[PDB]
Amino acid sequence: PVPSRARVYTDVNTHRPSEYWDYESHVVEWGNQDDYQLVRKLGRGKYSEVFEAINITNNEKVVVKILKPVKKKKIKREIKILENLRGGPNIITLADIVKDPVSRTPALVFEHVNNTDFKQLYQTLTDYDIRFYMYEILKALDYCHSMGIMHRDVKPHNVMIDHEHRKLRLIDWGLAEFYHPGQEYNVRVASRYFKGPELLVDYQMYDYSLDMWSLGCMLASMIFRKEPFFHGHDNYDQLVRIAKVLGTEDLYDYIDKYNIELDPRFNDILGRHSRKRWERFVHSENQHLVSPEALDFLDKLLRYDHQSRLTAREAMEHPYFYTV
């Protein structure tokens, strides 16, 4: 494959001491979980259990993510990233790192966020509200990209909104990684629907632009009221869903530009698809959320070529946000 590098914040990590990006050598100091009283279970992840809790020293509500220690290097990576990003705009705040004295299970303590449900928001959200919250996510992404970090799991489930207070938080930094130019990364990241074409064709030299594809997928679902926008049933089918919208010609130009070898599993399923116009996804149910600016902006995010996508900072300058 042809090598590639980020168009923005390319060497931010190279110009920083090893201390900033070397998570394996990071010293984690686990406090005592006795300062927290677990209130109720909020949910359960793949290798985590989330609880609502009270910090007994200051009577404040917190969220406690009890982690199944399946991989220690990955826990150190998440903690290092959360510590580097702590206090950043719209980034979830890691308040503490604790271990229970008897179980010794690792736990992350975060600031409490009073979430508004995905469905409860979906039907009442206005064109302005979409623009406002999209700008809030871009502030979080431009900030973490400037800090040399790729989230690698941007999706609605990882965006918490407190609609009453117009507060947005980008959560779950468990798949996040430090960007180093020329580094080959694992493509088994992000959730199926939000996976960029680079992951699906096994192109490992990806960058922050992966997060911009995922953001594109989220915007398309919101303005068109079609969740998810690219509804694949497996990782191979996911690329077919994208090809049914973006077309197969531009997909072959993308693999040819980077000398990517397509997996033979794509032979019987890819077919031939024309490039669709964004205006065909407009219907009576979503026309109040669509505008020429929204379509031009979406077109500039959902591009096969990761280098041809808007950066978070270029996206913030788009006319789609002139009203915020």
277 marked among binding-site residues = no
Contact 198, 188 (CB under 8 A): no
Q: Helix, strand, coil % (nearest 5) of the chain?
A: 40, 15, 45
50 marked among binding-site residues = yes
Per CB under 6 A, does 161 bind ligand 54R?
Answer: yes
- 203-222: which residues touch ligand 54R (CB under 6 A)? 218, 222
- Cα gap 179→257, rounded to integer Å: 22
3-state class of 36 per DSSP?
strand
Q: Which two tokens stand for residue 263?
A: 């997996």
Per CB under 6 A, does 128 bind ligand 54R?
Answer: no
The type of residue at 207 is D
- Cα gap 206→225, rounded to integer Å: 29
- Exactly one of 118, 274, 283, 292 binds ligand 54R (CB under 6 A); which one? 118
**Catalytic residue at 153?**
yes
- 22-51: which residues touch ligand 54R (CB under 6 A)? none
The type of residue at 313 is R
- Cβ nearer to ligand 54R, comparing 104 with 166: 166
Per CB under 6 A, does 8 bind ligand 54R?
Answer: no
Stretch that binds ligand 54R, among 24-32, 127-135, 140-148, 312-320 (CB under 6 A): 127-135
Per CB under 6 A, does 160 bind ligand 54R?
Answer: yes
CB of residue 151 vs ligand 54R: minimum separation in angstroms?
14
Per CB under 6 A, does 228 bind ligand 54R?
Answer: no
The type of residue at 102 is V
Letter string b/e over residues 273-284, b meaning 16 or more CB atoms within 10 A of that residue's CB:
beeeebeebeee
49 marked among binding-site residues = yes
- Exactly one of 157, 188, 283, 288 binds ligand 54R (CB under 6 A); which one? 157
- Cα gap 152→74, rounded to integer Å: 14
3-state class of 299 per DSSP?
helix
Tell me the number of residues near ligand 54R by CB under 6 A.
15
Per CB under 6 A, does 115 bind ligand 54R?
Answer: yes
Whether omega before 228 lies within 30 degrees of 0, making that bond cis, reads yes
Question: Which of 67, 66, 111, 65 is CA-nearest to residue 86?
Answer: 111
71 marked among binding-site residues = no
Per the annotation, binding residues for ATP are: 42-50, 65
Where in the sequence numbering do the catalytic residues fall? 153
Per the annotation, binding residues are: 42-50, 65
Residues lying near ligand 54R in the complex (CB under 6 A) are found at 115, 118, 121-122, 125, 130, 133-134, 156-157, 159-161, 218, 222
